[PDB]
Amino acid sequence: CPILWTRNGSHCYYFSMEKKDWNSSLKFCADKGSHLLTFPDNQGVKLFGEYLGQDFYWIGLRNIDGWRWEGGPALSLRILTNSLIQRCGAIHRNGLQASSCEVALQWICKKVL
């Protein structure tokens, strides 16, 4: 995969350096023929955490009527939440965490192959 993207077997990931709000992050991944990182089987979050310094990264997870993976099922994992108005999901070394969608954060894109 291209420069700035890193490979893990069959998976190609983009751990952004810049920060964007949730919607712009979703759009950046699509525009690059990829998608915001998801764990649709609700597995692998703890493991993946070993790749995340100390910052939070936007992932394809949102709460519109309960937490859901973008294009996937309902979240079955814990997500630490500070306030009820935090409706978009992020990941960091200690697990999943909610944040207001307008907040600029780094994001992670994923593409297969």
């Binding site: 630490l80 108005i85 965490q97 207001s100 954060l105």
Partner: protein
């Protein structure tokens, strides 16, 4: 409802100097004009007083001393936002902070 609250994470036993920035909260009402912030709750304006403070003009929530998970595991704060004329531009927002 125009509150914007970033993800708050904070380990116990942090090293200073203090105060140390946590996250910058804001109200999208600041698009119409400057907004001023304050916080209430235990750890803020009630015992343990002043452990958390907020920069009034910037919305920067900060912690003023090291924390001890075994002493106090979580804090519940409330954020407030007002306009130049001192009138509220948001209803208080409850913020639960868990000490990692």
């Amino acid at each position: 409802m125009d509150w914007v609250i970033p993800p708050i994470s904070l380990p116990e036993n942090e090293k200073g100097p203090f105060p140390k920035n946590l996250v910058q909260i804001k109200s999208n009402k600041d698009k119409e004009g400057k907004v001023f912030y304050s916080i209430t709750g235990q750890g803020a304006d009630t015992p343990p007083v002043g452990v958390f403070i907020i920069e009034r003009e910037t919305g920067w929530l900060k912690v003023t001393e090291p924390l001890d998970r075994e002493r106090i595991a979580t804090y519940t704060l409330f954020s407030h936002a007002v306009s130049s004329n001192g009138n509220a531009v948001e209803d208080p927002m409850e913020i639960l902070i868990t000490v990692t």
